[PDB]
Amino acid sequence: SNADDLQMIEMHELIQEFYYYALTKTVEGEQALTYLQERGFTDALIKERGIGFAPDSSHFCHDFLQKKGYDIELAYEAGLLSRNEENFSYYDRFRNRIMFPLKNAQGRIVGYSGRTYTGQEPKYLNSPETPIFQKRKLLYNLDKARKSIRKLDEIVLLEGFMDVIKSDTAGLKNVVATMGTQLSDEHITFIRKLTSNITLMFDGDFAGSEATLKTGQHLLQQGLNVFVIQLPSGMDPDEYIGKYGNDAFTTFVKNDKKSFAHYKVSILKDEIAHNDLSYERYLKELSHDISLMKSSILQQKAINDVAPFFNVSPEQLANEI
Ligand SMILES: O=c1ccn([C@@H]2O[C@H](COP(=O)(O)OP(=O)(O)OP(=O)(O)O)[C@@H](O)[C@H]2O)c(=O)[nH]1
Ligand SMILES: [Mn+2]
Ligand SMILES: [Mn+2]
Ligand SMILES: [Mn+2]
Secondary structure (H helix, E strand, C coil), X not given: CHHHHHHHHHHHHHHHHHHHHHHHHCCCCHHHHHHHHHXXXXXXXXXXXXXXXXXXXXXXXXXHHHHCCXXXXXXXXXXXXXXECCCCEEEECCCCEEEEEEECCCXXXXXXXXXXXXXXXXXXXXXXXXXXXXXXXXXXXXXXXXXXXXXXXXXXXXXXXXXXXXXXXXXXXXXXXXXXXXXXXHHHHHHHHHCCEEEECCCCCHHHHHHHHHHHHHHHHCCCEEEECCCCCCCCHHHHHHHHCHHHHHHHHHHCCEEHHHHHHHHCHHHHHHCHHHHHHHHHHHHHHHHHCCCHHHHHHHHHHHHXXXXXXXXXXXXXX
16 A cells, blocks of 8 residues: 555665664774775765665664564565564564665655675675565666756666766766666656657676667667667776776767667677678668667668678668668
């Protein structure tokens, strides 16, 4: 029910204050605080994002919510507590982790991502699916980024919320990220209400490239204008910012922004040039991709940009389309 949903949100927003205190003030949170500071987190940024620390006692959140008069089973359903199936006892889901609040589209805290700082697995532990937290719907930073997304008529999608935090601080405000999942149909429905222009800047690795191709292809099919920013090999936005700085990052992002079709063929360049079977198949694919582009202007430029990769004229490529 809506009443129960509000209770769950309250739990999250109240424990946030305790997590924040634990991180910034307490002895147990000292190492976690140092970790964040070494990753460039100022006191102001930590406070702004409401970042905290979950102690390792396994009953920190439990006792707090119990003291505040919340139903323990509801706290379990809210994904803040886990349940020992043997004795039906409850304990903290998040233990010895740095706690990043996950806010919904209305800016209410509906879940957490807890990062290890001692090299434990998994690196990030998220809230489970709950009535208020759904990974297929939530886009990190969306409530904060909405204004700039509308103003700039563009949304930029990153892989990690950490990248979003750093990108925002660097000056790139129209950024969001899924919680480690493939962009859903629901996400795309939400996004297209804000803008038709979506730029993908995933990590500069094989998985990032594969995700870019897959996500970009689906966005293109849905009638969105897709662009790609390709980071240097082995880097994500956070790593690029840490190595080159904020100004270099915002310049880089503004520099090479390619339409999806151009990025795609550039990735397939070597295979096309050596494999005649792949040549034919990718010429057909790229022809189909370009045909899907709603922008007549960018459709024409894509034709001019893609044609050289197949050693054909723009007129020849246009004919195939
Ligand atoms: O164990 C994991 C790892 C990743 N993820 C989800 O996948 C996204 C991309 O995972 P990454 O591992 O690329 O995140 P990152 O590099 O920004 O993390 P740091 O090492 O810099 O701290 C993350 O933002 C997270 O949402 C998890 O949920 N659990
Ligand atoms: Mn990756
Ligand atoms: Mn990354
Ligand atoms: Mn990273």
